[PDB]
Amino acid sequence: HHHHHSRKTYTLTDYLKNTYRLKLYSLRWISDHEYLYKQENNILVFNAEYGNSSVFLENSTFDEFGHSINDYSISPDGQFILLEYNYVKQWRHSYTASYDIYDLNKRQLITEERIPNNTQWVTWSPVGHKLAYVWNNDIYVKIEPNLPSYRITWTGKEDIIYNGITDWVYEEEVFSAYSALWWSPNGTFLAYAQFNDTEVPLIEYSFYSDESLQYPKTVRVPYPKAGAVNPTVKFFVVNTDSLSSVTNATSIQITAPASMLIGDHYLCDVTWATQERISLQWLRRIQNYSVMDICDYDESSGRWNCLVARQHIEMSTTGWVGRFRPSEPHFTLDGNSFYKIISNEEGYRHICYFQIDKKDCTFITKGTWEVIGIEALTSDYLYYISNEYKGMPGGRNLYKIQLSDYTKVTCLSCELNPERCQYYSVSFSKEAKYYQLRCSGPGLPLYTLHSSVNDKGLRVLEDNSALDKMLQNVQMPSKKLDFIILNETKFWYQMILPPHFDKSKKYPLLLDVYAGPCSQKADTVFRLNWATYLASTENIIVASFDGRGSGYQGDKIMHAINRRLGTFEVEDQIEAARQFSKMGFVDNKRIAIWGWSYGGYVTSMVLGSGSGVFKCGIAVAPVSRWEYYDSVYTERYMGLPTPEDNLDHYRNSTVMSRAENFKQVEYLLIHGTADDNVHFQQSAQISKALVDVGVDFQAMWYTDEDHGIASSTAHQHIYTHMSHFIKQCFSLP
Amino acid sequence: RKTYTLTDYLKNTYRLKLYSLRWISDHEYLYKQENNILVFNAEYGNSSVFLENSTFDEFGHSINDYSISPDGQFILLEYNYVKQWRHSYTASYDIYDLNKRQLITEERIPNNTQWVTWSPVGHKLAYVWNNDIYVKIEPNLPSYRITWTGKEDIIYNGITDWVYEEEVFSAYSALWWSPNGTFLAYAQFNDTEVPLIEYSFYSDESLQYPKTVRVPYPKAGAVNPTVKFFVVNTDSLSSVTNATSIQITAPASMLIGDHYLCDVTWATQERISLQWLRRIQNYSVMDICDYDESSGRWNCLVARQHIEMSTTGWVGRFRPSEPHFTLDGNSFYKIISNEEGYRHICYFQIDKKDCTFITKGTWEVIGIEALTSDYLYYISNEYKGMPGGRNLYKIQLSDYTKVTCLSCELNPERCQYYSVSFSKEAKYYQLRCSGPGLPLYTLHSSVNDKGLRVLEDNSALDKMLQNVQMPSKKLDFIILNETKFWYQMILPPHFDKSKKYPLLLDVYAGPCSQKADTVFRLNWATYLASTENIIVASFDGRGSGYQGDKIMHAINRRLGTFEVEDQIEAARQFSKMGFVDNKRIAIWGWSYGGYVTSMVLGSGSGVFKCGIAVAPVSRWEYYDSVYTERYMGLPTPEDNLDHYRNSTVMSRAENFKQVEYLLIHGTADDNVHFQQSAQISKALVDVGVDFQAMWYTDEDHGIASSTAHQHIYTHMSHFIKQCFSLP
Numbered sequence A: 001h002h003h004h005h006s007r008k009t010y011t012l013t014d015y016l017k018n019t020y021r022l023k024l025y026s027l028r029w030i031s032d033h034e035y036l037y038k039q040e041n042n043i044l045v046f047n048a049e050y051g052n053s054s055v056f057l058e059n060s061t062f063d064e065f066g067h068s069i070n071d072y073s074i075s076p077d078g079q080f081i082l083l084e085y086n087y088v089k090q091w092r093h094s095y096t097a098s099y100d101i102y103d104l105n106k107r108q109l110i111t112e113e114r115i116p117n118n119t120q121w122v123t124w125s126p127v128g129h130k131l132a133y134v135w136n137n138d139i140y141v142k143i144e145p146n147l148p149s150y151r152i153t154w155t156g157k158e159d160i161i162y163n164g165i166t167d168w169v170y171e172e173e174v175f176s177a178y179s180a181l182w183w184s185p186n187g188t189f190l191a192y193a194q195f196n197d198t199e200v201p202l203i204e205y206s207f208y209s210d211e212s213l214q215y216p217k218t219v220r221v222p223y224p225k226a227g228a229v230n231p232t233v234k235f236f237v238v239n240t241d242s243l244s245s246v247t248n249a250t251s252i253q254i255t256a257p258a259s260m261l262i263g264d265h266y267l268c269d270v271t272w273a274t275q276e277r278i279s280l281q282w283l284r285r286i287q288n289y290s291v292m293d294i295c296d297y298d299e300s301s302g303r304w305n306c307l308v309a310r311q312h313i314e315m316s317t318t319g320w321v322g323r324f325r326p327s328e329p330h331f332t333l334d335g336n337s338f339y340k341i342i343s344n345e346e347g348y349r350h351i352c353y354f355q356i357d358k359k360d361c362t363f364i365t366k367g368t369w370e371v372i373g374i375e376a377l378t379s380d381y382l383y384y385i386s387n388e389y390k391g392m393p394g395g396r397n398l399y400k401i402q403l404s405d406y407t408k409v410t411c412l413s414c415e416l417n418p419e420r421c422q423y424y425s426v427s428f429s430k431e432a433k434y435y436q437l438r439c440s441g442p443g444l445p446l447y448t449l450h451s452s453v454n455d456k457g458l459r460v461l462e463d464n465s466a467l468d469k470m471l472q473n474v475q476m477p478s479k480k481l482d483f484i485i486l487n488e489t490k491f492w493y494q495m496i497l498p499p500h501f502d503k504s505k506k507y508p509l510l511l512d513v514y515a516g517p518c519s520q521k522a523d524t525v526f527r528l529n530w531a532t533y534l535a536s537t538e539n540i541i542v543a544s545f546d547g548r549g550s551g552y553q554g555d556k557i558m559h560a561i562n563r564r565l566g567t568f569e570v571e572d573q574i575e576a577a578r579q580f581s582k583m584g585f586v587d588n589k590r591i592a593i594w595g596w597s598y599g600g601y602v603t604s605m606v607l608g609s610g611s612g613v614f615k616c617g618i619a620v621a622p623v624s625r626w627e628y629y630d631s632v633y634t635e636r637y638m639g640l641p642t643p644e645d646n647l648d649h650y651r652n653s654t655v656m657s658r659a660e661n662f663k664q665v666e667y668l669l670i671h672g673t674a675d676d677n678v679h680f681q682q683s684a685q686i687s688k689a690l691v692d693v694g695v696d697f698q699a700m701w702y703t704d705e706d707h708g709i710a711s712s713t714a715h716q717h718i719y720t721h722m723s724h725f726i727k728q729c730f731s732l733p
Numbered sequence B: 001r002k003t004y005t006l007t008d009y010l011k012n013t014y015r016l017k018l019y020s021l022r023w024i025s026d027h028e029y030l031y032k033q034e035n036n037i038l039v040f041n042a043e044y045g046n047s048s049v050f051l052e053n054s055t056f057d058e059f060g061h062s063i064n065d066y067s068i069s070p071d072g073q074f075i076l077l078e079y080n081y082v083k084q085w086r087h088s089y090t091a092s093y094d095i096y097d098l099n100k101r102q103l104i105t106e107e108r109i110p111n112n113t114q115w116v117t118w119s120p121v122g123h124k125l126a127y128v129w130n131n132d133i134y135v136k137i138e139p140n141l142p143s144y145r146i147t148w149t150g151k152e153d154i155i156y157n158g159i160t161d162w163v164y165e166e167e168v169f170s171a172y173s174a175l176w177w178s179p180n181g182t183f184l185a186y187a188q189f190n191d192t193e194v195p196l197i198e199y200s201f202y203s204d205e206s207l208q209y210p211k212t213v214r215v216p217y218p219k220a221g222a223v224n225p226t227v228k229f230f231v232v233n234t235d236s237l238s239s240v241t242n243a244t245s246i247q248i249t250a251p252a253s254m255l256i257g258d259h260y261l262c263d264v265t266w267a268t269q270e271r272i273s274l275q276w277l278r279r280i281q282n283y284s285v286m287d288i289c290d291y292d293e294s295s296g297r298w299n300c301l302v303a304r305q306h307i308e309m310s311t312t313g314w315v316g317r318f319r320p321s322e323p324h325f326t327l328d329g330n331s332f333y334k335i336i337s338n339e340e341g342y343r344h345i346c347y348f349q350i351d352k353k354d355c356t357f358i359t360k361g362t363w364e365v366i367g368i369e370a371l372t373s374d375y376l377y378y379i380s381n382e383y384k385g386m387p388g389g390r391n392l393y394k395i396q397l398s399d400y401t402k403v404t405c406l407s408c409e410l411n412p413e414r415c416q417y418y419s420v421s422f423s424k425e426a427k428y429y430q431l432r433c434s435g436p437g438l439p440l441y442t443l444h445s446s447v448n449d450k451g452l453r454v455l456e457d458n459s460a461l462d463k464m465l466q467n468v469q470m471p472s473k474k475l476d477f478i479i480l481n482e483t484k485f486w487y488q489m490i491l492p493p494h495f496d497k498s499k500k501y502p503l504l505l506d507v508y509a510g511p512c513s514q515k516a517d518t519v520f521r522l523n524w525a526t527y528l529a530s531t532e533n534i535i536v537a538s539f540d541g542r543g544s545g546y547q548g549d550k551i552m553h554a555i556n557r558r559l560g561t562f563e564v565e566d567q568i569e570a571a572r573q574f575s576k577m578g579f580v581d582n583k584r585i586a587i588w589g590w591s592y593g594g595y596v597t598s599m600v601l602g603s604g605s606g607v608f609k610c611g612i613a614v615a616p617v618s619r620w621e622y623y624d625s626v627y628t629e630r631y632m633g634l635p636t637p638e639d640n641l642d643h644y645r646n647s648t649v650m651s652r653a654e655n656f657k658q659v660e661y662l663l664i665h666g667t668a669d670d671n672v673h674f675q676q677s678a679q680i681s682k683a684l685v686d687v688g689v690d691f692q693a694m695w696y697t698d699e700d701h702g703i704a705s706s707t708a709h710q711h712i713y714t715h716m717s718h719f720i721k722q723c724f725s726l727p
């Protein structure tokens, strides 16, 4: 006799088995009018205008292929499709695979001059159907899918010389991509980077593999830890139109500016401006100085030249440059001008308009909020995402500013669905005629299509009504997004609150932390995660807090932990917990903390602080000492680990030094043994330190799991194990 | 009213006193008073300071050990000790003239020397350095380089590689001086095609990049090291020509395939015996090699070969036994399994195939301890048919039925486990009693076996112990299939059989193991019984040793079967004894014990609530070849692959859903690779089994660093207490 009251909760199995699924609407714009989508495994083509669709590629076309197809890529001219199979993951972005090209107008596979197995990367030219691929660390180009390839580079060498692909650090920390190949807009030129890792030390770890392997494998990866020798980089442009079968290809080198060549530096951004103009952004090893070169092709020479009067410098006196790297430029059509996000005089990131020949740029946006990204640029309008709306740093809306009058700024998403939608991202059609808006919260995700001419909504792509239907009688948690004031500054936090939240009660509280530089953990995003289960089923409040060092709020907050990681950011989580208890609905005896990666570091630093505030905590794949982490990320915030730079603080910010304070708390340390990112080493040293001072704690290694501990079975195992640990700690049955 | 606490165990509050002596002659031995080296006369009981602490104050290094040349004229001082594996280590050495009471500063033994030993007489010195053998005729003269093939991880001269060290010789050294020091026999090991186990060593926090340790280690069925044997005349060395080592080749019976050198024993000045063992360890051969005066060569008559083989298993307990030669070397005694499968002493004449057994019975000779012209002294478990007792016997060589027990009656209530150490010519012997009472060390004269005196009686420990509620020890047997199987129980103080106690089964259970005995111990179990009121039991089932081949060989080729089943059945019996809480039965073990613990927990028996496995083997293909193949044969379709694949803990993953499991393993375990637990953990994760875990960074198989040792026992205590609802 329940009278239809919601009696279900969001349980651990619901999360682990994905009972409640967020529907997505993932599309690929092929033109300015149409996009590809997946229905019941067939590749449909939709017409943005009307919404009429037809089948582009039936789900039976390749059922005789003989292998499982991981992904596909359609040539920009829509004449061929690249089929990806034998996918074998490497790091976060990299992987190898086999490829076959299917000709769409002959409905036939191409059996001649096939792309080799173990190919590291493949990319179509942006127009037409030329192919560039990397194999054995060398670059190859196919002008037509059925013709022999032209070998561009001959120096490729496993673990030493990389042409067209990155090494570990560049992939993970510099580019966020494996690809180091950049086609000119019309395909004439193929720009690439070459990395030399000759003297970069190798991290080595065991890989146990299937139980069949009698002897474990030692994995060895070139990986510069803080202060170690970094890979070097060279940049080249090759004219693909002048490739020859009788002569080797001529790659034209573009050298980094003299102000970079004086020392260690990085190539940090490549952006084509026009068919014959390419911009390159370089960053010094001490990451407070970057130079943007703008280089033009010379018809006579066949060379590329960068004019000093076109160099733009971007520096910082308070920290590093950019959120994680200097922003990318968005060039106007003629390539004589560009827009880009930079910190203004007050430390807020806003869009600056540069003329190619001029040092002084002018700001088209301003205010105490920040521009997240530039999404599209037309002749009349620039579209961007910002967190200006209602001054909520954790909110995201799409705006459009008239290039001819900066006072004319329109918000396109703010008011579409104000109660349901406050976190937007966008996907523009090939020439911005249309755009898809994706709102991730705080209500159920909603995907809509729009024409930009007069920004009316065309239709609802995905509204997650099915999920909405399932959730009706489930006691879901709510989210509170608000701020507290420390030293006259707003600091935002979020709390996942148990259903039927009652201020009169004292809830156990879990602090879910990340808190690295430019992080944001308090936002308007709707999530179905572990926190969802903890709040809904176990009545635990899960809070996150963005303190000093956090992003999207100006350099004053973000740069506060410069050269001093493991200080304010750690101190702030503690102060947040104190604040949370003073609110009156938190049980002081049951406050815990957990985090992954930087978050595991903070968790561990917090637990080893002697603050007495936290009963227990969980660190997953934590950094433990900055010298063990990679050079480009670490040194960005910590400078060099030398007596003449910042060695003292490197040594003062390790978790191992706080070992003794762990006697006051219950600690669960978790790490995957094949973590190529934060090495198991880091946790191995935390554990040895705890053992050395006689502190008891809980541990779990994950055989062959990497930084994401994302294998289906491992993912379920870790959240199960962490759930027991938290329940135990909080005396929950 | 205090109990024996975890801290007591961890901090060694109550220490067992020892009386470690080393004989120097037939009537004197050395002893170390905390601080001091004394010389004792065996006859009178009187000492004088032999080496005063202060002799080396000005040294400037910290001394690990010392070694007196047999003639008594020099003392080797060992320092800068750096442990390698179980027995192997590196160290620096200095030689001090005793009569001139000064350091030798000339032609010093190098730093990083791998092994050094004095000749059995005089003061010649042999050492191994950088995998090469060197000889020093006199402490202060250049050393002669015997071998030139030494090469790290590849060629080992005079020292063993990983597997020979751990599993064959139980020693780092592969050097054997003839009785009067004339000859230096040595083995050479070639590991060229032996695969390497690689694992990470994290080192001090200061190391930025972990180091990868790489060790030549043959896992089951892999390529093995090869071995060569050599003998060098140290009396005809030169300072001008290189020494010439005479090779003794293995017998043709061994040369037809993979084989091992398993025993080297000098019989006389010019006769050496070598035992060889086929890779399939059920066939071994003893060659007896004589020096040929006119040829400079060593010849082994095919007619003097002695074969020892087994039809039911491997040969020997862990390896063929060592022979004990009569003074003339034309005859010898060695322990072999008789026709009923019981290990007894057999008397061989060098020239004849058939030997005669001088002992017999349903009990076993543990070891031959000494032999004189008139008697053979040996240790056995004959006393009262108790396999876990040990007593010293002496057999009259002119009449084998004339057998005197020398220790059975010294103190029957307190002493039932003896070991012995005879003086250089058996004039005297020290008796070491290890239980069931407090260890008792006594000295005796072998002429009439009279007790000269009590060397250490542990009276101090006995007084301290009066204060603490100590647990007791019950040693008994149960009957399974008309056969006796022994078990022990450490029972809590004031034990009351009308009460239901939690029980922890402490298991090892490897082949020839013995966990039920009369030895007195102060260990983790003591604490659990005394403070936590937990019964900790151990059981010796099929596969266990010292009770004959029918029991020991029952697991031949079938590891992970009967020995596992018998631990479960034993637990079932214990619960039927009435004083066990059957909802609180746990099991734990280390190494082979971790394997059995895991196989038991993965058995679905439903008998055990929880368990702890420490450094367990998880699948036999991961373990070393010598130990593994000895019991399992080869992992190939034509041999025993099926059972190798059938006996893994990983295969029993799903059943772990019924128990609480704690898995612990040191990451620098060179013996049972961390790999073994990494595969267990992955298998449990794959079937969605939750369990507890703990890795120990940089710890090896003993997890024996002071802090790690304390930390593991503390962690395990919490787990068992949680499991048994003990706050």
Ligand SMILES: *[C@@H]1O[C@H](CO)[C@@H](O[C@@H]2O[C@H](CO)[C@@H](O[C@H]3O[C@H](CO)[C@@H](O)[C@H](O)[C@@H]3O)[C@H](O)[C@H]2NC(C)=O)[C@H](O)[C@H]1NC(C)=O
Binding pocket: B149, B155, B190, B191, B192, B193
């Ligand atoms: C340790 O064992 C090693 C391999 O079992 C052994 O190496 C082998 O040595 C021979 C002679 O130096 C090398 O080769 C020669 O003759 C054979 C014909 O039987 C040819 O195949 C070779 O080309 C060459 O002419 C082998 O190459 C070598 N095997 C290897 C290195 O794997 C060592 O000599 C042994 N060490 C000692 C001290 O005995």
Ligand SMILES: *[C@@H]1O[C@H](CO)[C@@H](O[C@@H]2O[C@H](CO)[C@@H](O)[C@H](O)[C@H]2NC(C)=O)[C@H](O)[C@H]1NC(C)=O
Binding pocket: A155, A161, A196, A197, A198, A199
């Ligand atoms: C990769 O980088 C290394 C330097 O880190 C280059 O090695 C130098 O090459 C020159 C010319 O042969 C040698 O004389 C030097 O000894 C090398 N330095 C070393 C090995 O440290 C190497 O040439 C580079 N390769 C490429 C293709 O750029």
Ligand SMILES: *[C@@H]1O[C@H](CO)[C@@H](O[C@@H]2O[C@H](CO)[C@@H](O)[C@H](O)[C@H]2NC(C)=O)[C@H](O)[C@H]1NC(C)=O
Binding pocket: A186, A188, A239, A241, A242, A275, A276, A299
């Ligand atoms: C793509 O861009 C290129 C560069 O702007 C265009 O072409 C000329 O570039 C080629 C390079 O091989 C030179 O050989 C020609 O000489 C260039 N121009 C002159 C005046 O000589 C090319 O036409 C563009 N393609 C498309 C389809 O627009």
Ligand SMILES: *[C@@H]1O[C@H](CO)[C@@H](O[C@@H]2O[C@H](CO)[C@@H](O)[C@H](O)[C@H]2NC(C)=O)[C@H](O)[C@H]1NC(C)=O
Binding pocket: B060, B092, B108, B109, B110, B111
């Ligand atoms: C063994 O090692 C020691 C220590 O390295 C050797 O001696 C040192 O040599 C340096 C000069 O190279 C001196 O400045 C040190 O003072 C020496 N240490 C000491 C304690 O004196 C020693 O000579 C080595 N060789 C042998 C055979 O032991």
Ligand SMILES: *[C@@H]1O[C@H](CO)[C@@H](O[C@@H]2O[C@H](CO)[C@@H](O)[C@H](O)[C@H]2NC(C)=O)[C@H](O)[C@H]1NC(C)=O
Binding pocket: B148, B241, B242
């Ligand atoms: C004693 O034996 C060694 C090793 O066989 C001799 O030395 C090597 O001989 C080669 C030439 O055949 C030299 O190039 C090496 O430098 C020598 N050293 C080593 C460490 O192998 C040594 O000369 C021998 N000589 C005699 C004459 O018996």
Ligand SMILES: *[C@@H]1O[C@H](CO)[C@@H](O[C@@H]2O[C@H](CO)[C@@H](O)[C@H](O)[C@H]2NC(C)=O)[C@H](O)[C@H]1NC(C)=O
Binding pocket: B280, B282, B283, B309, B310, B311, B312, B633, B638, B639
């Ligand atoms: C030594 O052990 C081996 C293997 O356990 C015994 O051999 C047999 O092995 C051969 C070769 O692999 C097989 O073809 C036979 O089928 C096995 N069975 C039998 C009954 O022999 C060998 O007999 C043992 N030697 C001794 C002396 O017992």
Ligand SMILES: *[C@@H]1O[C@H](CO)[C@@H](O)[C@H](O)[C@H]1NC(C)=O
Binding pocket: A045, A046, A047, A052, A053, A054
């Ligand atoms: C949508 O209708 C137009 C009108 O003819 C047609 O050209 C187009 O092919 C249709 N869409 C698809 C996806 O085929």
Ligand SMILES: *[C@@H]1O[C@H](CO)[C@@H](O)[C@H](O)[C@H]1NC(C)=O
Binding pocket: A098, A114, A115, A116, A117
């Ligand atoms: C790649 O591998 C497959 C199967 O291994 C083989 O049949 C094929 O011919 C190889 N080469 C290419 C280019 O796919």
Ligand SMILES: *[C@@H]1O[C@H](CO)[C@@H](O)[C@H](O)[C@H]1NC(C)=O
Binding pocket: A154, A246, A247, A248
């Ligand atoms: C291209 O370059 C490679 C290496 O530099 C060389 O071996 C090859 O001969 C060249 N090919 C031609 C056709 O010159």
Ligand SMILES: *[C@@H]1O[C@H](CO)[C@@H](O)[C@H](O)[C@H]1NC(C)=O
Binding pocket: A286, A288, A315, A316, A317, A318, A639
């Ligand atoms: C870059 O950082 C270094 C070290 O903090 C400093 O010496 C230098 O002045 C910085 N550059 C700028 C422009 O602040």
Ligand SMILES: *[C@@H]1O[C@H](CO)[C@@H](O)[C@H](O)[C@H]1NC(C)=O
Binding pocket: A486, A487, A489, A548, A572, A575
């Ligand atoms: C100082 O101000 C910052 C914010 O600007 C605030 O987080 C902090 O708590 C104040 N406290 C300290 C401890 O310096």
Ligand SMILES: *[C@@H]1O[C@H](CO)[C@@H](O)[C@H](O)[C@H]1NC(C)=O
Binding pocket: A647, A648, A649, A651, A652
């Ligand atoms: C900790 O910081 C102080 C300066 O506040 C520095 O002197 C000390 O050396 C640092 N710790 C380490 C381990 O260097």
Ligand SMILES: *[C@@H]1O[C@H](CO)[C@@H](O)[C@H](O)[C@H]1NC(C)=O
Binding pocket: B039, B040, B041, B044, B046, B047, B048, B049
């Ligand atoms: C031992 O005692 C005897 C007394 O008979 C004495 O002659 C001998 O030298 C003593 N020496 C030592 C070192 O005890």
Ligand SMILES: *[C@@H]1O[C@H](CO)[C@@H](O)[C@H](O)[C@H]1NC(C)=O
Binding pocket: B180, B181, B182, B269, B270
């Ligand atoms: C040691 O034995 C050998 C027998 O060949 C002999 O030549 C040597 O001299 C012996 N020791 C002596 C006689 O002291």
Ligand SMILES: *[C@@H]1O[C@H](CO)[C@@H](O)[C@H](O)[C@H]1NC(C)=O
Binding pocket: B480, B481, B483, B541, B542, B566, B569
């Ligand atoms: C019979 O064999 C042994 C003793 O010989 C015994 O331990 C075992 O439990 C009995 N039965 C079975 C089926 O193993």
Ligand SMILES: *[C@H]1O[C@H](CO)[C@@H](O)[C@H](O)[C@H]1NC(C)=O
Binding pocket: B641, B642, B643, B645, B646
């Ligand atoms: C495991 O053993 C059984 C028989 O005991 C056998 O049938 C099975 O095939 C064995 N393992 C393998 C890998 O074949």
